[PDB]
Ligand SMILES: CC[C@H](C)C(=O)O[C@H]1C[C@@H](C)C=C2C=C[C@H](C)[C@H](CC[C@@H]3C[C@@H](O)CC(=O)O3)[C@H]21
């Protein structure tokens with residue numbers, strides 16, 4: 695059918711410049727691969743606050759992933775995940791911003807630490823949520839369990855834990871083998 699996909703990427707202070715970059719490159723790889731498909735994209739950066747780097751309308755209008763994310767400025771603050779999510783839910787998946795009413799709403803969260811806030815994600819009930827946790831902060835099984843609450847059930851299917859940002863490349867290779875013409 696139609697897939698409206700939003701990348702919710704972590705731009706906290708824990709990230710080294712090169713790690714932030716690998717996050718941006720992953721997003722561009724996926725978008726470059728699925729260009730001219732049924733997929734529509736939007737990108738939202740989160741730390742303390744939230745910024746929509748580009749919405750579904752910009753994507754359709756300019757279509758170039760490199761131009762779309764060219765002026766992203768790393769925020770360097772905390773990780774307010776609950777707020778970031780309801781923000782997407784309520785401010786990004788909006789028709790005025792180019793979201794298609796008959797589209798499946800998928801949300802891919804990319805983070806490197808646990809959440810520095812709280813609340814609930816009820817506004818995001820009908821959104822498919824994948825969570826990609828990367829790095830040292832998710833070494834313990836205990837810290838990996840904190841992500842389960844932002845992701846769709848079953849977590850083993852929706853939560854991805856990578857030990858290095860180098861692994862995001864291996865994740866893209868794994869994504870590519872599931873690409874099929876229907
Ligand atoms: C597909 C395997 C890769 C590693 C992956 O998980 O990509 C997931 C997670 C992430 C690596 C990027 C994605 C980009 C596009 C789609 C939404 C993809 C999930 C596609 C699957 C296939 C159907 O069951 C629909 C669905 O809900 O999820 C995600």
Ligand SMILES: [Mg+2]
Nearest residue numbers: 706708806807
């Ligand atoms: Mg962090």
